[PDB]
Amino acid sequence: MPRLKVKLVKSPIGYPKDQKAALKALGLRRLQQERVLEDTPAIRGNVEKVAHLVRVEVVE
Amino acid sequence: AHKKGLGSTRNGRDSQAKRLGVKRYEGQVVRAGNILVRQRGTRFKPGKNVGMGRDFTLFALVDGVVEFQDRGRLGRYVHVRPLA
């Protein structure tokens, strides 16, 4: 399984609490936060839930 | 202002909603005396170590796990099977 890699692009303040629970499920702190990640449909869906606050790249 | 003849009603009366539904499903261990289906008419007919009471309510007789069944020309079935 390749490695996933994502940042945080769009502020958490004023959006659903579930999506923010995903943002905790990743570890996404403040704005501009490059994150090293592992691939799995679980975390994949977790991140797909925030497909707008987050920059996507599958660094291998 | 002037507020002439108005009126009243007769409908400020509601029935205290009683929590009804199905509690346990296939995948859950239910051990002897656990209600798992709340209903009024036979929405869920008993069976394999399943039980019914004085108000059409399914529960657990065994320490077994639930599962379901469909038998059209008979009804809807619940069978709580355990282990050999």
Binding site: - | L6, G7, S8
Partner: protein, 141 residues
Amino acid sequence: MLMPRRMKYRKQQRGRLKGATKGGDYVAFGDYGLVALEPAWITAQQIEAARVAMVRHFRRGGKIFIRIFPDKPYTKKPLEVRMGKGKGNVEGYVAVVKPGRVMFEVAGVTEEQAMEALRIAGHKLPIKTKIVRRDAYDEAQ
């Protein structure tokens, strides 16, 4: 006009009316037709107003059909009252009509006849409509 004389509920809640006609844009009846453009109630008062203006303009005319039917209870509270204490009154007996629904159609008329007629008849209603012929409408029952 027209409605039930005794249905099921004196009152019923307003509801939400978004769109899609639910069903009814073809024919099987008239040869020209009038079709709505907005999702609103049409009042049976306005309905019969159209029926009038229609058979009115063209006298001795043939037969016109109404696909719609005003069967919606409007809740009209008494005048000069106060908030709460009840509801409205079984007034404004109307029908739920959304865009693309054939309100009403003519058959046996003349070209320009059906034109000017349905033109005015539609000009009456609380909206604006489409004057349509009969060709594509074929099939769908």
